[PDB]
């Protein structure tokens, strides 16, 4: 009934927030709408898979908060398989390679690819992580979709097709759906194109032994019966002395403060008294989540390793159900599996099919890409379509359509009286990830602690020690990469030796 | 407790739907979240204004359904003032004119303007009203914003500025915010550029004597205590034999069917069991409403008419708080007033000011455009910012960002088991208006009537007799307008 802080939502952010508050001796209640904690992380367990992450899963270098927190909860990581060759499948052929970036031979194409990625990071450098609307050209970059930007920047179809896959993969949305400013912010705040795309030394280096769902499950264990499941919040009243929070089943909770730790658009499921301020009122109708089906096909053995393939497939073009895969085999080498994402419009389109129909399409795709009939012989299949989740709205995260981030960005984490905002969307380093979930949860908790006089303002935002288990190598660029001209820069140079 | 149909929302669409069902002998309950009916229409009454429409207001030729319905409720229209000259204010100077289109004098510019509007209507011709996503170039047109389209089409800055003002005014959103396909559909479904922009012979011809709020009020009057106010729906359960609808104050309603007659995105304020299908689930997080403050400044007299101005100002450029105005004086010639809209990003920006600060900016603006010190002497001011409305989400209506209408358009009025969808957003003629609200409410009601076996399939969509009080003259184009080349068409000819 009465406590210090009600935390709305028990995903990683809500739980990290509750934990920090509880570790400070405050009385917290977590109101979780679902019959489970974890939210957009969700580890399934059964005999066939032992365990499998059907939601968020990968962690890696620079993601120190999720790594620290999981470690304290007694969790361990292992390295995603990347020993053997990666594959880029383009125009129906596979080209095996090594290193994070699919290589390119043609010198003109090479110059355009190089400049594309370089320019993403160049542009990124002008974008404050904590205030992207302050970039010098914020409006100009916000009033254009990623599709316009790629049209402008890519002088080859090849660079454009790969850049498109990259956007689709990073943010489970189409290039024409999303703002260029927001997309560029998003990548920059993960440390740039290399850090974000890499398995070794990047965001996909590792997974947790046993599944990421353990993070929220273990904090639930620690909080005992402070975590209330099947308590969807429907109503928040801030007109009186104490904040009142009512759940759908009719329970009523009183607190000094509230943490909203749910996706920004899911705030729409709460009726507010007094009404939200105008800007948040509209903000929450303007920030949708992406579309993805996570798909895991199981095999007797990891046969691809025998062909010197690690299981990483970068798959170009419209006909492919899945554009990207990673080896999902257990660290002991059993429950051999290929993980793949069905992205954006493909999530929407292929959802009309049955589970067995999608499994067939993936197997046939993988058999072609790996050149292996063994791909046609799955032993099991698990998949989750996150578009269908009432209390997620999609996955991995919230994207910003053109014009929104400069108009409404400021509002995202601005307190509304005694409501403070956690949730990975409000993070400034790896927002969209489990990492940002922890950052934003602990920052919101601390904001409340500051409101209560327990900590000074300087302690709201707090840095994090580098994980000793997963250290970060720095990101390096060669001299040519840095200085080779772009395609139009080459044209202008050829033009100059004619005049 | 138990009835035949729960109608969620008491705005024009909800009320039209409830009325039709009641007139058929069914038992309806309207659950309205606010302490009043009307929704995006809202007539304020006080001594100073007598009455004033602070939400939806204008009606005109071809809007036969709202006209028929209002007439039946005993309501009358009068003509918006357009006797004297209109003003176009461009680069800080007023150029008075007659007719609906501001004239353009430079030859090259004239060609570019002409082609821009013409091309809007040409493009619209390939867009089915009931299925815009079936336009032959739907994906191409949907994956680009109106800003890209204008950049492509407008060879002059003047045509581009005016076309931008046009979009901002039509849909209370920025050209870079909205899909080209959706916006082109939107205009086409109101009958094209001329019909949609015109006062005489178009959407802005008329207002209702006493306020448009009376439409919903008078229906609520007819339904008595069937209309429940301050009943925000929070929950809809379709797992059992009858549909269960719970309101925030804890009441529970049972019905055979439900009509959702609220803005598509406001569906998010309802928890559903079972969950909505995947497509609707994500659809409702992708369809925001625009941004507008409606602002009405009152004067002792309609002084503008003395200078042979009617009160219509078309005002170009960033610095102007308001891009468009209309005379809001009562038909009797008193409560003289000028109505203007603060649109899109300007609604966002100027909301930071106080009421009195916005009043000042608006009087100074009107003093410049009208060339009158009299504009600086207002006797009263009413305004409403719809962005702040929890149970609207904005005004006038729902816009579609790039990519959404083709992926999710089909889903808008698709029934979800026993939930049918009204609301102006689901209409196919004057969607976004009071007209489309009636069309959509009456169609949804008839869909339920069909599901019940009372009427055949062919009766779900029903045409409407032309109003005798407000007849439509047809839209005409001259021979030159139809055949003059574009600016690149002229270049290719040279
Ligand atoms: C706001 C506005 C303004 C300011 C203006 C205007 C408008 C608006 N409009 C629109 C109208 O109004 C609309 O459409 C209608 O109203 C709609 O209806 P419906 O569909 O029915 O809807 P609503 O109303 O919203 O209702 C709903 C209801 O529900 C409820 N809820 C919610 N949620 C809930 C509930 N309940 C229970 N539960 C839950 N949960 C709410 O509350 C409500 O009630 C318009 N229209 C017309 O027609 N007219 C007019 O005038 C209008 N307006 C505008 C206009 C403008 N204009 C025209 C302009 C000028 C010049 C120009 C233009 C445009 C163009 O195009 C060009 C030029
Ligand atoms: C879905 C997904 C996510 C994902 C990804 C792949 C997929 C398919 N891969 C990731 C990865 O490999 N590495 C990574 O770091 N992140 C990855 N992501 C995203 C990641 O899962 C999310 O960023 C993270 O889980 C975010 O967590 P957060 O705590 O910030 O938010 P949430 O998980 O959605 O939790 C919100 C909880 O709130 C509940 N809820 C919703 N509405 C209510 C109401 N009204 N009342 C009470 N509770 C509510 C939800 O049930 C949820 O539990």
From Swiss-Prot, chain B:
Provide the reaction this enzyme catalyses: a secondary aliphatic amine + O2 + H2O = a primary amine + an aldehyde + H2O2; (R)-adrenaline + O2 + H2O = (R)-3,4-dihydroxymandelaldehyde + methylamine + H2O2; a primary methyl amine + O2 + H2O = an aldehyde + H2O2 + NH4(+); benzylamine + O2 + H2O = benzaldehyde + H2O2 + NH4(+)
Stated consequence of mutating residue 384 to M: No loss of activity
The listed outcome for residue 392 to A is: No loss of activity
Q: What, per the annotation, is the impact of changing residue 156 to A?
A: Dramatic loss of activity
The chain residues annotated with the modification N6-acetyllysine are 50
Q: What is the effect of changing residue 310 to S?
A: No loss of activity
**S-8alpha-FAD cysteine PTM sites in chain numbering:** 395
* Result of changing residue 3 to S: No loss of activity
Query: Result of mutating residue 170 to S?
Result: No loss of activity
Q: Which cofactors does the annotated protein need, by name?
A: FAD
One cellular-component annotation, GO: mitochondrial outer membrane
Signal peptide boundaries: none
List the GO biological process terms.
Answer: dopamine catabolic process; hydrogen peroxide biosynthetic process; substantia nigra development
What topology does it adopt in the membrane?
A: Single-pass type IV membrane protein
Provide the effect of residue 295 to S: No loss of activity
**Keywords linked to the UniProt accession:** Acetylation, FAD, Flavoprotein, Membrane, Mitochondrion, Mitochondrion outer membrane, Oxidoreductase, Transmembrane, Transmembrane helix
Oligomer status and interactors: Monomer, homo- or heterodimer (containing two subunits of similar size). Each subunit contains a covalently bound flavin. Enzymatically active as monomer.
Entry-linked PANTHER family: AMINE OXIDASE, AMINE OXIDASE [FLAVIN-CONTAINING] B
Q: What is this protein called?
A: Amine oxidase [flavin-containing] B
**Which organism is this protein's natural source?**
Homo sapiens
Q: Supply the gene name.
A: MAOB
């Amino acid at each position: 009934n009465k406590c210090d802080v009600v935390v709305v939502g028990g995903g990683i952010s809500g739980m990290a927030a509750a934990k920090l508050l509880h570790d400070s001796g405050l009385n917290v209640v977590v109101l979780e709408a679902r019959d489970r904690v974890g939210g957009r992380t969700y580890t399934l367990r059964n005999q066939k898979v032992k365990y499998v992450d059907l939601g968020g899963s990968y962690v890696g270098p620079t993601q120190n908060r999720i790594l620290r927190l999981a470690k304290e909860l007694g969790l361990e990581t292992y390295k995603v398989n990347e020993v053997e060759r990666l594959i880029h499948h383009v125009k129906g052929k596979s080209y095996p390679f090594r290193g994070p970036f699919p290589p390119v031979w043609n010198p003109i194409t090479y110059l355009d690819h190089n400049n594309f990625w370089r320019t993403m990071d160049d542009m990124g450098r002008e974008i404050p992580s904590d205030a992207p609307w302050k970039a010098p050209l914020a409006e100009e970059w916000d009033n254009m979709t990623m599709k316009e930007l790629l049209d402008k920047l890519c002088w080859t179809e090849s660079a454009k097709q790969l850049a498109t896959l990259f956007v689709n993969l990073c943010v489970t949305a189409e290039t024409h759906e999303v703002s260029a400013l927001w997309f560029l912010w998003y990548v920059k705040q993960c440390g740039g194109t290399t850090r974000i795309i890499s398995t070794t030394n990047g965001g996909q280096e590792r997974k947790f032994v046993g599944g990421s769902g353990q993070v929220s499950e273990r904090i639930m264990d620690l909080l005992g019966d402070r975590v209330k499941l099947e308590r969807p919040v429907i109503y928040i009243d801030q007109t009186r002395e104490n904040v009142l929070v009512e759940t759908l089943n009719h329970e009523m909770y009183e607190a000094k403060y509230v943490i909203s730790a749910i996706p920004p658009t899911l705030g729409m499921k709460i009726h507010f008294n007094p009404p939200l301020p105008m800007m948040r009122n509209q903000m929450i109708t303007r920030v949708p989540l992406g579309s993805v089906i996570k798909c895991i096909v199981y095999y007797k053995e990891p046969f691809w390793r025998k062909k010197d393939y690690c299981g990483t497939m970068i798959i170009d073009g419209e006909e492919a159900p899945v554009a990207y895969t990673l080896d999902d085999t257990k660290p002991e080498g059993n429950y051999a599996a290929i993980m793949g994402f069905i992205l954006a419009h493909k999530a929407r389109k292929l959802a009309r099919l049955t589970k067995e129909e999608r499994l067939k399409k993936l197997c046939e795709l993988y058999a072609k890409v790996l050149g292996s009939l063994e791909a046609l012989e799955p032993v099991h299949y698990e998949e989750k379509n996150w578009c269908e989740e009432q209390y997620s709205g999609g996955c991995y995260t919230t994207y910003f359509p053109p014009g929104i981030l400069t108009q409404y960005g400021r509002v995202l984490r601005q307190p509304v009286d005694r409501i403070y905002f956690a949730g990975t969307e409000t993070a400034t380093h790896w927002s969209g990830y489990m990492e940002g979930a922890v950052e934003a949860g602990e920052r919101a908790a601390r904001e409340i602690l500051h409101a209560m006089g327990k900590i000074p303002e300087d302690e709201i935002w707090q840095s994090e020690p580098e994980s000793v288990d997963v250290p970060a190598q720095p990101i390096t660029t060669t001299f040519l990469e840095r200085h080779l001209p772009s395609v139009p820069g080459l044209l202008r140079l050829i033009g100059l030796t004619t005049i």
